Write an enzyme that holds these catalytic residues in place. Structure first.
Site, short mmCIF file in Angstrom:
data_model
loop_
_atom_site.label_atom_id
_atom_site.label_comp_id
_atom_site.label_asym_id
_atom_site.label_seq_id
_atom_site.Cartn_x
_atom_site.Cartn_y
_atom_site.Cartn_z
N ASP A 35 -0.90 -8.58 11.85
CA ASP A 35 -0.29 -7.53 11.06
C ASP A 35 0.61 -8.07 9.95
O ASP A 35 1.76 -8.43 10.19
CB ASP A 35 0.54 -6.65 12.02
CG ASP A 35 1.20 -5.48 11.33
OD1 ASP A 35 0.85 -5.22 10.17
OD2 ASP A 35 2.07 -4.83 11.99
N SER A 199 -0.33 -3.39 -8.23
CA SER A 199 -1.67 -3.23 -8.75
C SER A 199 -1.58 -2.71 -10.18
O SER A 199 -0.67 -1.97 -10.53
CB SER A 199 -2.48 -2.28 -7.87
OG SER A 199 -3.71 -1.95 -8.47
#
EC number: 3.4.23.22
Length: 330
Positions: A35, A199
């Protein structure tokens, strides 16, 4: 040194991925959820409340000759999905894919929430976010990566998650045969303890690319792709009959649909998520309403590039002094 381990979807939907991890001496092999959105290595154990164990493999520290109680240490974690666990702490030898860390903090669960009990395939979590998020008290502990880093040939790990198929976590090297083209690296903020990046935009299907900054985290421990409501609405508007269902808890679409791809930007590069990756199947057995793999982050407080996004890429988690993230097509 290096390590390389195969990671395998837990079910036919890729709801999560498990990777075998050797703990203790002699080795006890547990299948852990790697994770990158948390920083605790915790396991079902011989200390876990019996009624809360249903099929998981447990770590029994009393059977490990290298296990030592970390005296006074406790841990307690709540995840973004409302699940939680807590317990005490041992140090022990932990190996992943041939890479060994001695003295790793192995957090032994005394209690786990229902979601964990109900998932027999996940024996615990191995956190790979920054150690500043580790929950051990009163002495915070380091992640497996942080402990291994100095010994690694290069201070990196990579995630290469498969679509309905096994993939690979590598530590200490970049497998140049595992991706196509070049890796585009992008800046990371560690200020919230996550692999947080920005992004450069998105496209829906064959549509034109929208240049826009989307701050979010690279999180292997989250199943889906959670993005701003504007972006998500623009995606689902291209699927006839798709809608946000308050009762189901997100966007659903007719199982008869053919889903468009979703592209996200990494600098001047582009990662294409095929439409099939966005199908999470019937909302309940036999339903013709299917759950979407792109969902709104509104009310999460952060955008999350989870498995739906990451499995479309070869992802480098670069833990150099100034960390960065790399993405390649594959």
């Amino acid at each position: 040194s290096t390590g390389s381990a195969t990671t395998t979807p837990i079910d036919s939907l890729d709801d999560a991925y498990i990777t075998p991890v050797q703990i203790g001496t002699p080795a006890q092999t547990l299948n852990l959820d790697f994770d990158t959105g948390s920083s605790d290595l915790w396991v079902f154990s011989s200390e876990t409340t019996a009624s809360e164990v249903d099929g998981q493999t447990i770590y029994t520290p009393s059977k490990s000759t290298t296990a030592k109680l970390l005296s006074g240490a406790t841990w307690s974690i709540s995840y973004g999905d409302g699940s939680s666990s807590s317990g005490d702490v041992y140090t022990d030898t932990v190996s992943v894919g041939g890479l060994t860390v001695t003295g790793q903090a192995v957090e032994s669960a005394k209690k786990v929430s229902s979601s964990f009990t109900e998932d027999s395939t996940i024996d615990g979590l191995l956190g790979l976010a920054f150690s500043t998020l580790n929950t051990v008290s009163p002495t915070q502990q380091k992640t497996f990566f942080d402990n291994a880093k100095a010994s690694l040939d290069s201070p990196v790990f990579t995630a290469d998650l498969g679509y309905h198929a096994p993939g690979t976590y590598n530590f200490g090297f970049i497998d140049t045969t595992a991706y196509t083209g070049s890796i585009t690296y992008t800046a990371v903020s560690t200020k919230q303890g996550f692999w947080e990046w920005t992004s450069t935009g998105y496209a829906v299907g064959s549509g034109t690319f929208k240049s826009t900054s989307i701050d979010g985290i690279a999180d292997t421990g989250t199943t889906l792709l959670y993005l701003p409501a504007t972006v998500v609405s623009a995606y689902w508007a291209q699927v006839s009959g798709a809608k946000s269902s308050s009762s189901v808890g997100g966007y659903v679409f007719p199982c008869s649909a053919t889903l468009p791809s979703f592209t996200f930007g990494v600098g001047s590069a582009r990662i294409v998520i095929p439409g099939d990756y966005i199908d999470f199947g019937p909302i309940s057995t036999g339903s013709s309403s299917c759950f979407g793999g792109i969902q709104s982050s509104a009310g999460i407080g952060i955008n999350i590039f989870g498995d739906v996004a990451l499995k479309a890429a070869f992802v480098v988690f670069n833990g150099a002094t100034t960390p960065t993230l790399g993405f390649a097509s594959k």
